[PDB]
């Protein structure tokens, strides 16, 4: 399920993201030895945290947003969040004729584009596999012919089976709405709803 944004629903301009906050949550156990050497240990997973802020909402905008959020809380679905700043179209073509060799469980994807894709991905972009909902950021990219060497920040959450297909454009965050236990919005005497905030967390 998609969170309402002024792409799908421009008739409600108040539903735009006044300010997004992409939080990097990678819990680690960091210990500082007296000999000046700082040591880290990583066990848990990394999850992208998204915080959405909203302006004053008119009754119709709030009605639409609240209906969507209640539909989410009813069906127990997953809110999809689209960040416009990450929607630069660089890689274009078909992602079905590209092959990803299997057995890749590290933090690096080696894929043979088979010359079917034009353009090259840029470092810091958003990358995602077609068979897993986790979202990756490209930290480095080296192309030697048709084989690409894409480096990702989160260690690969799945081991490639050889059937996965890279996804570069149209990437959505399969988030789950936090702070929904006590979710409310105050209605002022002037008819507009205020104090609406969405603390979302990537529940892959």
């Amino acid at each position: 399920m998609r969170l309402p944004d002024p792409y799908t629903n421009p008739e409600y301009p108040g539903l735009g993201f006044e300010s997004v906050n992409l939080v990097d949550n990678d819990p680690m156990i960091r210990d500082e030895l007296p000999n000046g050497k700082v040591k880290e240990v990583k066990i848990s997973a990394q999850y992208w945290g998204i915080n959405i802020s909203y302006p004053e909402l008119f009754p119709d905008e709030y009605a639409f947003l609240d209906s969507r959020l209640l539909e989410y809380k009813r069906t127990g679905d997953y809110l999809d969040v689209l960040l416009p700043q990450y929607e630069a179209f660089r890689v274009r073509g078909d992602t079905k004729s590209v092959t990803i060799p299997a057995g890749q469980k590290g933090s690096q994807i080696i894929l043979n584009t088979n010359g079917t894709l034009t353009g090259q991905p840029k470092a810091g972009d958003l990358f995602k596999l077609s068979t897993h909902p986790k979202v990756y950021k490209i930290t480095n990219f080296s192309s030697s012919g048709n084989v690409w060497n894409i480096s990702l920040y989160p260690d690969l959450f799945i081991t490639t089976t050889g059937s996965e297909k890279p996804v570069f454009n149209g990437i959505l965050f399969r988030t789950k709405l936090m702070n929904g236990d006590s979710f409310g919005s105050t209605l002022n005497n002037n008819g507009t709803y205020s104090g609406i905030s969405l603390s979302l967390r990537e529940s892959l």
């Binding site: 680690m28 040591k39 880290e40 240990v41 990583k42 066990i43 260690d155």
Partner: peptide, 8 residues
């Protein structure tokens, strides 16, 4: 050599 250990 490695300061960051990913134990499991």
């Amino acid at each position: 050599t490695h300061d960051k250990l990913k134990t499991a």
